[PDB]
């Protein structure tokens, strides 16, 4: 708690998400780039992404973040909710973060089989992604994004 509550607060104080991209994994074409910082806890962020990303066989997600604090095991846990039902659960690991560094983090996200794909018009506005930001076992922040497919 309080000893790590303060550590979590220090890391979060010095953390910034600079930008986020979605690229088609095959062609490299940027499909979406994020404006509003989506990591900020306490508010429900919104994101409007092109419906064609659902047709990609795979997308590359790129996060660029800065951290004044060192981290030994920077990682994300993401829960994807559809109308409140957990649809997906994902774990992403970055590892060691140098103090005062700026880092690009790339994660490959493949499409579900076509027979299990859901239509954009059904998903849009009904998807919440809850992201937990950890440094090893230390929970730093929890943030939420509501997803629209435009």
């Amino acid at each position: 708690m309080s000893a790590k509550d303060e550590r979590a607060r220090e890391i979060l104080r010095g953390f910034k998400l600079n930008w986020m991209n979605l690229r088609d994994a095959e062609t490299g074409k940027i499909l979406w780039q994020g404006t509003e910082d989506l990591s900020v806890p306490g508010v429900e962020h919104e994101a409007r992404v092109p419906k064609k990303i659902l047709k990609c066989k795979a997308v590359s997600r790129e996060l660029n973040f800065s951290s004044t604090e060192q981290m030994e095991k920077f990682r994300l846990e993401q829960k994807v909710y559809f109308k409140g039902q957990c649809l997906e659960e994902w774990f992403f690991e970055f590892g060691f973060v140098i103090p005062n560094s700026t880092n690009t983090w790339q994660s490959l996200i493949e499409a579900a089989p076509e027979s299990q794909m859901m239509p954009a018009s059904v998903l849009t506005g009904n998807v919440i992604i809850e992201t937990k930001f950890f440094d090893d076992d230390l929970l730093v922040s929890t943030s939420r994004v509501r997803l629209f497919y435009v």
């Binding site: 979605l22 990303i53 649809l87 997906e88 089989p113 992604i129 997803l147």
Partner: protein
């Protein structure tokens, strides 16, 4: 043909060499032996650690390459029983795994001067979640049962690992 790398550990003088010789040559330094267990022909690569244990590189190597371990104490030697946890903790650390196929072996069960009760050995093995088998290398009692039970432990672990649908995303997010 499935091969199995078995490693016999335990304090000096508990009977690691006698157990190995009984399994191999049927009478009272690794060795490859073909055996039929549960109707399946198995190649057993058996290492008696009596010689190698005192050399750090050797001990680390046989703990890395061993697939299952017979942890042997002698039922008339309390200090050999107390040493068991040192071997188990070493193997686990080397393997960085809490699920290492293992069988607890109480050898020399032909001796009446017993100082380690079967119940306390059974309690140790229960706390580890591993089988416990009493043997006499002198009379051959339990010898095959100990090595075959360990092979079965390895088989169960290997079947677990080769079963533990890589998941994909409906949202791309």
């Amino acid at each position: 043909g499935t091969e199995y790398k078995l490693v016999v550990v335990g304090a000096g003088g508990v009977g690691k060499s006698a157990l190995t010789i009984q399994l191999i040559q049927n009478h009272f330094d690794s060795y490859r032996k073909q055996v039929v267990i549960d109707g399946e022909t198995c190649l057993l690569d058996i290492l008696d650690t009596a010689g190698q244990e005192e050399y750090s590189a050797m001990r680390d190597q046989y703990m890395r390459t061993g697939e299952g371990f017979l942890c042997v104490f002698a039922i008339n030697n309390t200090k050999s029983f107390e040493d068991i946890h040192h071997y188990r903790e070493q193997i686990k650390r080397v393997k960085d795994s809490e699920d290492v196929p293992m069988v607890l072996v109480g050898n020399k069960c032909d001796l009446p001067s017993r100082t380690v009760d079967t119940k306390q050995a059974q309690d140790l093995a229960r706390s580890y979640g591993i089988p416990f088998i009493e043997t006499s290398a002198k009379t051959r009692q339990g010898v095959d049962d100990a090595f075959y039970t360990l092979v079965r432990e390895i088989r169960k672990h290997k079947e677990k690992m080769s079963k533990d649908k890589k998941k994909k995303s409906k949202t791309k997010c």
